[PDB]
Design an enzyme around this catalytic site. Sequence first.
Site, PDB file in Angstrom:
ATOM      1  N   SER A 140       0.452  -0.909   0.213  1.00 56.51           N
ATOM      2  CA  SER A 140      -0.189   0.249   0.043  1.00 56.51           C
ATOM      3  C   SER A 140       0.709   1.135   0.146  1.00 56.51           C
ATOM      4  O   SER A 140       1.661   1.443   1.118  1.00 56.51           O
ATOM      5  CB  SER A 140      -1.074   0.041   1.285  1.00 56.51           C
ATOM      6  N   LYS A 187      -6.560  -1.042  14.356  1.00 62.41           N
ATOM      7  CA  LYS A 187      -7.120   0.007  13.801  1.00 62.41           C
ATOM      8  C   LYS A 187      -7.929  -0.398  13.215  1.00 62.41           C
ATOM      9  O   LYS A 187      -8.992   0.619  13.173  1.00 62.41           O
ATOM     10  CB  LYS A 187      -5.762   0.430  12.770  1.00 62.41           C
ATOM     11  N   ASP A 188      -8.033  -1.402  12.145  1.00 59.06           N
ATOM     12  CA  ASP A 188      -9.119  -1.921  11.566  1.00 59.06           C
ATOM     13  C   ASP A 188     -10.067  -2.427  12.685  1.00 59.06           C
ATOM     14  O   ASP A 188     -11.202  -1.666  12.557  1.00 59.06           O
ATOM     15  CB  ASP A 188      -8.832  -3.168  10.551  1.00 59.06           C
ATOM     16  N   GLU A 214     -31.713   6.837  -5.098  1.00 60.80           N
ATOM     17  CA  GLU A 214     -30.897   6.623  -4.509  1.00 60.80           C
ATOM     18  C   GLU A 214     -29.515   7.517  -4.553  1.00 60.80           C
ATOM     19  O   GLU A 214     -28.965   7.964  -5.372  1.00 60.80           O
ATOM     20  CB  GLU A 214     -30.923   5.916  -3.176  1.00 60.80           C
TER      21      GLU A 214
END
Lengths: 37, 43, 78, 62, 164, 55, 379, 379, 241
Positions: free
Chosen positions: G205, G227-228, G271
């Site tokens: 990442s 964190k997740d 929507e």
Amino acid sequence: RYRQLARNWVPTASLWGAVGAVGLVWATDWRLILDWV
Amino acid sequence: LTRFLGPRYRQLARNWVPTASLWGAVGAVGLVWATDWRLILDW
Amino acid sequence: GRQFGHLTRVRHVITYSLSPFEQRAFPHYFSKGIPNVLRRTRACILRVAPPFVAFYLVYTWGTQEFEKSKRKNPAAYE
Amino acid sequence: VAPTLTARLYSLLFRRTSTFALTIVVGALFFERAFDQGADAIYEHINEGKLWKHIKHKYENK
Amino acid sequence: KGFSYLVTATTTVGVAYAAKNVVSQFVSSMSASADVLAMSKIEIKLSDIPEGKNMAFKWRGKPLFVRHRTKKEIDQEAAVEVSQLRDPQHDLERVKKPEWVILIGVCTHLGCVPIANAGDFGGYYCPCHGSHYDASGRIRKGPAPLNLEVPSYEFTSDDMVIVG
Amino acid sequence: KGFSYLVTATTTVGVAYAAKNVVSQFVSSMSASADVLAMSKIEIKLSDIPEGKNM
Amino acid sequence: MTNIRKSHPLMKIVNNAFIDLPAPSNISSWWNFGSLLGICLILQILTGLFLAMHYTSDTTTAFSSVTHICRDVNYGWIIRYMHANGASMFFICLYMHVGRGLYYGSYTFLETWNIGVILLLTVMATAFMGYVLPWGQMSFWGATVITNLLSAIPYIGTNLVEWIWGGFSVDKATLTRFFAFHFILPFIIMAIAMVHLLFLHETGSNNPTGISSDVDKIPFHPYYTIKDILGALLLILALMLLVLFAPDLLGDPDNYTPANPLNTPPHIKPEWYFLFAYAILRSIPNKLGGVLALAFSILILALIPLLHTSKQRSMMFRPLSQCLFWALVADLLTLTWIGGQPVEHPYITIGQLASVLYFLLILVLMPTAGTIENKLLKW
Amino acid sequence: MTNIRKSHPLMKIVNNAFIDLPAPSNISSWWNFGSLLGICLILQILTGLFLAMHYTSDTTTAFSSVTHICRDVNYGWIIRYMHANGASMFFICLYMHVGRGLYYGSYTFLETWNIGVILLLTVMATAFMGYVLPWGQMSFWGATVITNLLSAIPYIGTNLVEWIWGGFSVDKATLTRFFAFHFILPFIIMAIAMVHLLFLHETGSNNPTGISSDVDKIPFHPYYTIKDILGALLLILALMLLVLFAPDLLGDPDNYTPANPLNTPPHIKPEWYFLFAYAILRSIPNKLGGVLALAFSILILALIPLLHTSKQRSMMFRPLSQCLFWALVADLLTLTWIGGQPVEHPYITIGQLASVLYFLLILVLMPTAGTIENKLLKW
Amino acid sequence: SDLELHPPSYPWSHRGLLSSLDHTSIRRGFQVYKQVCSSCHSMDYVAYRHLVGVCYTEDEAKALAEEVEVQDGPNEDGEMFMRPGKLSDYFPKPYPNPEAARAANNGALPPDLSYIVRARHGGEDYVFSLLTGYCEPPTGVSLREGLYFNPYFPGQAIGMAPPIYNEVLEFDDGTPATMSQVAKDVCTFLRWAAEPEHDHRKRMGLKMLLMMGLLLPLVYAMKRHKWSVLKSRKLAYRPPK
Ligand code: HEC
Ligand code: HEM
Ligand code: HEM
Ligand code: HEM
Ligand code: HEM
Ligand code: FES
């Protein structure tokens, strides 16, 4: 410039594409395209 | 089967029971919330 | 195919760290946070400030104008 | 000497896989039609007059 | 080389024939089941709608309008200058018998059902985005691009119209 | 060290309570409905059939 | 190795993409949307399977069925509203995900960006079909108007719209089809998500700074698993805040009216997640022009990798692009506003300018700004 | 490497398990059932999704719905009869698969064996719920009597049968549940299959001789792609032969009768795949004893690894097991027969000795035979 | 626990893989159902779609379907203003609803013939041998009037009135209406009705059978060539020294 390099493919490439396009339609047998032959 | 059994192994089993014993208690607690025994609720 | 021993080459860098149980999750959080949060926000607001202002201005104009046309028609023609 | 039918066929259509494929596309087409025609015929023969195709007459246009 | 290749080549054609046929069957099913025969081009009405009041019928999931027009409505529709219509058609090009206008009751803009006797032309008014149609089903104002669609229809004996 | 462990433990308990309720809710919807369960245990009928047959 | 559980089972090794993997240190909160994105898919899935445990797919019932799920079934009410609200989350989350790779140059990962794009447009179809299942006024008319928008194609279109519907309108035929496709798309999607993750595990990442972090890499397990979990905590918070305090709030549509095919909400609209596209579609007079333009709004995404002009994959160190970046998001917000607007002068004229400003920002402005910035740095 | 398409994409490398993989030379025709196994999984799915493109999951309609798929819908008839028949094949294929594993000791691959087993049982669930979707007399009752057979469990059972059903009987509630789980199982199962494949890829395919072939290995592409295509060709053959010439033949059940909850076909029985299970339950007087023994029928598979007694994982060189292997298969056929039999003396007494024979063959005979053969070879 | 007699593999035009349905039989049979059978048994999935299936024209069946809607019409379905015309309507339900149906036949419930040949285990054989099978109750047997004795009913007793009897109806052409002759035609219309796909399937099967056979032969040959090299190859061990 580019065409000269790919000229051999162009001729060979042209034949495969026409065959492939025609064949898919032929296997597909869509009525409108076929009517012409 | 036979290979697993040993004279030496006992301390691990004793240790396992507590962790296992502790683990066993959790399930009763876990099951009980779902089970909702009136008697369990009464407890 | 190994991601940890093969990332990159690093020479001459020393790193010092401390254990979770020796420190506090937040050290001077109120004091540190206000500055950094405040400093970062101002820069961020400026860069993203332009997009926000235009949307608010256009929304107000659109609601008013659409409503305005709908609101009066009888007075104009007689 | 002349090339066996296969050798002829080979050099004209199967050296290049573009040609080969083209062939097969074409063939698939032609083949489907003949097969059907033949294979439908064969099947209708085995049920002469048993099928509506044979039997439409009776109540059609007077 | 030719003989070995031919067997594979002949084989390739065979798979394609069946493959094309097999693929077609799955595809065919989504396209047609009972389909149009069950729900297409079938209608019959006249008794329900009368005295200038348009009647709507469920034909192929869509509103089919059969409207009995008054002489005044017929005259008004006659006096429209087709040359200034966005989808120019003379009322008589849209009907078989002037007192009867038959229309697919679907606004040509985005599909809503126009409301009869509303709008600025006494024809129809589509509430979704404001398309106004006249008593001929012609679009006069709003975003719709075309006049309401006219289906194929015939009148049998014993006062009846067959649409489809 | 104990304080750190305690903080971690506290977070888990909060999740578990929510998890039990959330898990229970998912399980509960599947098991029964007050649609069906309205008709359950509610039945009466009499005197409308022959003194002889079986309905 | 012996008794290293992880590599023992080959299968269990495959799972050490969670625990041992190289994870950048520095890393905005934005990244938590990938994981969250996957929580949303799992949530939707469990919910769906329980809803589809008490739903029926017929004209007659559907409405009732949903109505029965929310009344007589035990905890089916929250399950359904969790479901509905979820999908809002699922989208809110998806558009954070795309913004982060539009900003930080994550899209540099061509392969991974083309799977993303596939993901985004798969999830779009699922949400389009699932909203019609209930068979309410809004649903009914929305699927007519969209599908029929396909009939803009000149030669085929017309025939094709009728194939998709399985008839001349939207009756039973069509409503069962949506039920089937809605149920099987998220299971196909799950394999794509895992194919997405696959590619992305080959390069790791990106970061705020835009620079390689191989010099500073962290174990995913220690750090990122918390964190997740924390990001889930907040994520669920929003889901439940929505679903418990304001069930309907974010579900614009109030149409809890069984569909009547002659009846029409003059205000027909997808929507919130679709508004952008909608607005961009109305800006064009011509139907076909709109459909192409509709497609391009979304499909335009794969072209950005080619559009990248700068030498810094990170927007972080580039002002001007940060400024246009933000505008485009606010332009995007502007366009979503037009979606719930009467299609009248005031909104028309606005939308049109917005639609050009969107394509400008993506197709011409940013690209130039990229060059400029490079030339200011003397690059 | 450069422009080696295969390993360029990382994704496309993962596909080189088909083309480049080490495949043993020698290899009975039996192994084509793996591949066909997948074939069937993919066919059911494509078929399912189209049927579930015109099926409704309510009491009222379900029968009608199927009836309508086979009448008014274009090519819906073959799709449905292809789907019914397929599942037969799917099982016919499954039981070849497990035979092979039993006979050549492919089951040595414990981890692969355990996935297989899960596979087998998952499909088993699938097949049980799908057959109930059409909601016909056989289906209706079959669900009751199987599900209820779960109420044998002493403490819970009873409560639990009622949760599974969503009420006291098998009305709508149950009917929509099966529709949803039938739909989602196959997708989950595909993940399993691939997981199964994963593990198997780590040790390659055993042979009739029973020895490693590493000294003889062949291109999977060149050879085994045609074999597999050929396999198909025969597989399809059987599926269309069935589906086109004798649609109902293999589908014992003639009950095209809408389910009437007071009515009963005195002859209630599962299909051919589940025929063995019904028979196992019958030989035991006691309910609970029968449920345990039913589970053990199927669940006894995972023991066989541990039962293995010989030094030759290949039965090929051990006559005696080749004889008791065949007998089990013919005992299995014998049991299948009982399944469609009145539960009366004649059949009872037979089934009971067949159910002991099956467990002897698997638990006790074979294992001993193994030893013997080893001792005759002086091993 | 009574022995059940089973149906002969009665000589049918279609018994055979390639054999197909005989529409004239269908046609005839139809009428039989419509006159003999419409009275108490329904056929819900059957529309008035015989057209091509039954050789009845569109005009033919339209008309045939019109009178059935004029007399039994959509007034029994719930269409108040309904009369002649429509073709989407399905065969008319003998009675409003099942419960009625049992009353008319005293407790019994006339099975929907739609799927009966397929529906009853034993196919059109059973159906033919039921209708044509009616013999004298067996010495020492008792029978409630409804309980007519039939040699082929599970429980050895059926609530069926004279299903079919000689000269029950008359066909257009002049087909000799024998009890049996009519049954042969009635079954056939049931078989065609029970499995509409099957009639199409047999024709398809023939096409499928040839293609599969041809494909199989080529594949075995194609398959052999690819695998020929491994098979052709002989490996000889070479001593190290
Ligand atoms: C007069 C009303 C009536 C007519 C006409 C009639 N049936 Fe029936 N039929 C019944 C009743 C009532 C039963 C129920 C038998 C029972 O439950 O014992 C029945 C039962 C049957 C069965 C028995 C299946 C089973 O095992 O339950 C078959 C087959 C059948 N009908 C077919 C036909 C066919 C074919 C025709 C026309 C050729 C026909 N019936 C004409 C009233 C009728
Ligand atoms: C991430 C992918 C998915 C998205 C975006 C999604 C979204 C939706 C939406 C937006 C609706 C409309 C609900 C309403 O407004 O009333 C819906 C309904 C429904 N969905 Fe999903 N869904 C997804 C996955 C699934 C799955 C996996 C299943 C089943 C396994 C499923 C089953 C259903 C059912 C049965 C309904 C109808 C009942 C209802 O209206 O809630 N969905 N879905
Ligand atoms: C079903 C929807 C999706 C799921 C479940 C999902 C999942 C994930 C996950 C778990 C990660 C790793 C963590 C992270 O970077 O946040 C990630 C990264 C990534 N995803 Fe998504 N994704 C989805 C949709 C998309 C879309 C719509 C796009 C863009 C079109 C996309 C492109 C990317 C990229 C480019 C990265 C790598 C960025 C970086 O870390 O440098 N994804 N994805
Ligand atoms: C191997 C996995 C599956 C097996 C063994 C299987 C088997 C069956 C069986 C035995 C029936 C009963 C049909 C009858 O006799 O009338 C059935 C029906 C049905 N199945 Fe499948 N099926 C499977 C997968 C699926 C999938 C994946 C879907 C949807 C995508 C599906 C949808 C249906 C539907 C809608 C019906 C009901 C209508 C009918 O009777 O055809 N099934 N299934
Ligand atoms: C969903 C059903 C299944 C599918 C699609 C499937 C598929 C496959 C395929 C394609 C192969 C390779 C070829 C072969 O050896 O025949 C294979 C091998 C194997 N399968 Fe399955 N299988 C399934 C079920 C099972 C079950 C239920 C088990 C055991 C409990 C199992 C255990 C094995 C084993 C042990 C092998 C490797 C044998 C060897 O070559 O040594 N399979 N499977
Ligand atoms: S439907 Fe759009 S204005 Fe009428």
